[PDB]
RNA sequence: AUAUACCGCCAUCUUCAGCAAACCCUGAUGAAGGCUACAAAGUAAGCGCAAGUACCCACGUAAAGACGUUAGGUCAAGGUGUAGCC
């Protein structure tokens, strides 16, 4: 009957089963041709009450098969979803810049990356198994600056923006021997995770694991070599890449820890000795005790490449440019 | 623009002249030398450790005059830029003075059971815009617990300086400003909110001086 | 923005840092009085690691 | 768990009435009865129709003003008179609402044979009550 | 035909007191955790208890009882997804 039929939100609430249309019908028109001087006309102007012919109506019914169709292409559009480290996969996705503060304070220069996602569960009391999302950014804008920080809430698009908001306030800055690179080649452990990370000069790429190269490209460093070793969590590397690049001598300081000159030779030039750094005020006239040979716990890892011995299908491969 | 009155105490040393109002035989009759037993005796301030007198341990007063004088001359640069000041302390013996103290200059003071993240959180404690205390100053560092108090820790993280009382039991890392001193004695403290007082009402005053001086020019 | 690690350097090594990169927009205002009268020592924190072999705390008896 | 009339809350991003964030035990305490008419009193007569006139209403009003019939109806009745109150948006050309106002004022006259005589008040937005 | 697609109306724990968005901290920034009034990190809109309201009172019995648990129950109240018969 008449009063067997509804409403529209008792019609969807029962179609969509969330629990465990309106835009193109315009008020004024009516299947049999049809017009009326309220609405539907040149308004109070035809003033009078007349129908359409048949044909003409088949001229504008027609019309709404072509909207709606048109309108519905529309919705089956395939969104150009930059590919992070592979498709199906939030690796280095891009979000867009974080989000400004409650008086101002803008981040326009910086940039968000993901890390890694994590579908992360806990039994609880009443419901069971307790999906929540734990995601992982960094944050930096090249020059030097970088963060990073985790989010985790029971939301996709929720937990991002709490990782976004932390992460710009846990900076650090890298410093950099002039923009392209770093110091010294560091090696150092974050608990399990051996990173082996040394100084590359220009043009070299960034031929780093997946992680490291999303997050140079984000402090700026263009291209270092570092082979990550033992166990590779995508948190714990991180936090490994991120104190060694702050614990880092710049050659002002190697200068004024020791007093002496800091000289640099360039293979690519030759002998000239370009000083990077004097000491900042006295000038020590004793010379450096130069003991060859000394006890620095080198590696073997270098030794093998050095002395080239061995040998690996995928030691230098001709990937992408970055 | 008159950063001109801003631009020149810095090149000044002791503007205030604040070494007038302090000095070693003063220090002294206020016992700040004393301290707690050498069994508790932090292993960060041993570099302020005269000796342990059977079994009790003095603090160089040597080294805390070229403290006290580059703190108090911190405290004193301060009021004179305006900025906001705290007194955070949680003996329960001063509890009266260090607020009586803050009523009497024009800063504030905080007491009491410190709310956790009272700095952290100051959006949405306090308002949406809130200015934060640009100094923090600490009479006692250690809790009713004798544990590091917690606005050690978060006046570090969220970047405001802090000077404090450093005593034989408390760690002196997160303190930008150390003055290694007794604190639970109320001889010390009397003095101690003798001259973190004085330094800042000369500072009030020196600013209204040289402000009208421009103005006159 | 702001940077609250309080271990991976002091107050000032940050706020120095991070206006060198130009991410603040303003310094703070106590920034130009440790630029005048540093303390005497650094205030960065360092894990308190507790005294094992033969190895005694460095201060002396009064006598 | 009863569900009669009660807006579940999930999230704060639903915005909610203040006839519809009552449950439905309120009806005297902190609302009141939509329609008005002497039927249900005791013991008098054609109250039987007087519901069929009543949801017959609500159910062509929220028709011939779609998507801007903001809250509920108010269909009173005094004697040969009925009056209806009611709520609308502001966002369709007050030409095509007095049109409207015209047209069902002499459409329901004729078909329940009474003066019907419909009042509107605008609001222009949705008076929301609770964010939940 | 399918309550093992659902709305709609409910049963149960519920004669409960919890659930919670949003931020902050602690765990070397791991799953997670966040209690100490002579107080060591929590703050909290919002929901429910409570409080108000009905009945003969402020008592009482009603009414109320969130989030969830059992693919609880109902296509046979009505509507309706999918598949079917015409
Ligand atoms: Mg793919
Ligand atoms: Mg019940
Ligand atoms: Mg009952
Ligand atoms: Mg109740
Ligand atoms: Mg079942
Ligand atoms: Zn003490």
Redesign the pocket.
């Known amino acids: 009957s008449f009063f ?1 039929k ?1 409403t529209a939100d ?2 969807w ?5 969330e ?2 249309l309106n835009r193109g019908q315009i008020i004024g028109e009516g299947r049999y041709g049809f017009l009326w001087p309220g609405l539907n006309v040149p308004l109070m102007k035809v003033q009078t009450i007349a129908q359409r012919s048949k044909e003409e109506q088949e001229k504008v019914e027609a019309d709404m098969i072509q909207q709606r169709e048109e309108w519905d292409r529309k919705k089956k559009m395939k969104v150009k979803r930059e590919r992070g480290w592979s498709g199906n996969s939030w690796g280095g996705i891009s979000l867009g810049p974080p989000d400004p503060g409650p008086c101002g304070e803008t981040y326009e220069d910086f940039d968000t990356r993901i890390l890694e996602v994590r579908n ?3 039994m609880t ?4 198994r ?1 999906k ?1 999302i ?1 995601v992982l950014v960094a944050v930096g804008n090249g020059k030097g600056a970088a ?4 989010g ?4 996709r698009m ?1 937990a991002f ?2 990782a976004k ?3 710009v ?2 900076l650090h800055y890298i410093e950099r021997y002039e923009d392209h690179t770093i110091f010294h080649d560091i090696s150092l ?3 399990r995770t051996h990173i082996k990370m040394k100084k590359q000069p220009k043009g070299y790429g960034l031929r780093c694991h997946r992680a490291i190269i999303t997050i140079c490209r984000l402090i700026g460093i263009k291209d270092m070599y570092a082979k990550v070793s033992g166990s590779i969590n995508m ?2 590397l991180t ?1 490994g890449l ?1 104190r060694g690049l702050s614990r880092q001598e710049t050659h002002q300081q190697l200068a004024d820890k020791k007093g002496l000159h800091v000289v640099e030779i360039r293979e690519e030039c030759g002998p000239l000795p370009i000083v990077v750094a004097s000491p900042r005020g006295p000038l020590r006239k004793d010379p450096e005790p130069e003991d060859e040979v000394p006890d620095v716990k080198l590696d073997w890892e270098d030794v093998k490449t050095a002395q080239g011995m061995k040998r690996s299908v995928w030691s230098n491969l001709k990937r992408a440019a970055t | 623009f008159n950063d001109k009155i801003l631009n020149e105490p810095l090149k000044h040393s002791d503007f205030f002249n604040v070494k007038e109002l302090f000095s070693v035989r003063s220090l002294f009759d206020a016992r700040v030398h004393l301290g707690h037993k050498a069994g508790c005796r932090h292993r960060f301030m041993e570099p302020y450790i005269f000796g342990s007198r059977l079994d009790h341990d003095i603090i160089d007063l040597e080294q805390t005059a070229t403290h006290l004088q580059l703190a108090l001359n911190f405290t004193a640069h301060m009021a004179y830029r305006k900025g906001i000041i705290l007194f955070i302390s ?1 003996n ?1 013996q001063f509890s009266y003075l260090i607020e009586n103290m803050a009523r009497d200059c024009g800063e504030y003071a905080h007491t009491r ?5 009272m ?3 100051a ?3 306090f308002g949406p815009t809130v200015r934060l205390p640009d100094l923090i100053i600490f009479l006692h560092t250690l ?3 004798f ?1 590091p108090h ?1 606005a050690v ?2 006046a570090a ?1 969220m970047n405001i300086p802090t000077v404090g009382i450093v005593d034989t039991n408390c760690n002196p890392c997160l303190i930008t400003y150390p003055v290694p001193g007794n604190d639970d004695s109320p001889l010390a403290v009397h003095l101690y909110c003798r001259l973190f007082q004085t330094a800042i009402t000369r500072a009030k005053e020196k600013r209204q001086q040289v402000e009208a001086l421009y103005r006159l020019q | 923005a702001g940077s ?4 991976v350097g002091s107050i000032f090594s940050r706020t120095r840092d991070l206006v060198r990169a130009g991410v603040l927009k303003e310094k703070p205002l106590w920034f130009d009085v440790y630029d005048a009268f540093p303390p005497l020592r650094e205030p960065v924190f360092q894990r308190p690691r507790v005294r094992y072999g033969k190895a005694k705390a460095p201060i002396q008896d009064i006598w | ?6 807006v ?5 991003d639903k915005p909610v009435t203040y006839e519809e964030a009552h ?1 439905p ?2 009806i ?2 902190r609302k009141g009865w939509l329609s008005l008419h002497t039927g249900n009193l005791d013991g008098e007569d054609h109250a039987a129709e007087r519901t069929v006139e009543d949801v017959f209403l609500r159910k062509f009003m929220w028709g011939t003003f779609p998507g801007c019939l903001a809250d509920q109806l108010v269909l009173k009745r005094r004697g040969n008179q009925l009056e209806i109150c009611a709520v609308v948006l502001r966002q369709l050309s007050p030409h095509k609402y007095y049109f409207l106002v015209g047209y069902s004022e002499t459409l329901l006259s004729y078909f329940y044979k009474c003066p019907v005589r419909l009042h509107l008040q605008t609001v222009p937005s949705k008076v929301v009550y ?3």
């Open positions: 067997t509804l008792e019609l609430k029962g179609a969509l089963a629990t465990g992360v569960f806990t009391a009443k419901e069971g307790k929540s734990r963060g990073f920080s985790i985790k809430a029971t939301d929720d923006r709490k908001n932390r992460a306030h846990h452990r974050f608990k948190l714990s936090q991120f | 949680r329960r059971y410190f709310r956790g993240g700095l952290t959180n959006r949405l404690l809790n009713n617990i544990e917690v820790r978060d993280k | 609250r690690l309080e271990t | 768990k009863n569900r009669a009339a009660r579940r809350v999930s999230k704060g449950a035990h309120y005297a305490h609770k964010y939940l």
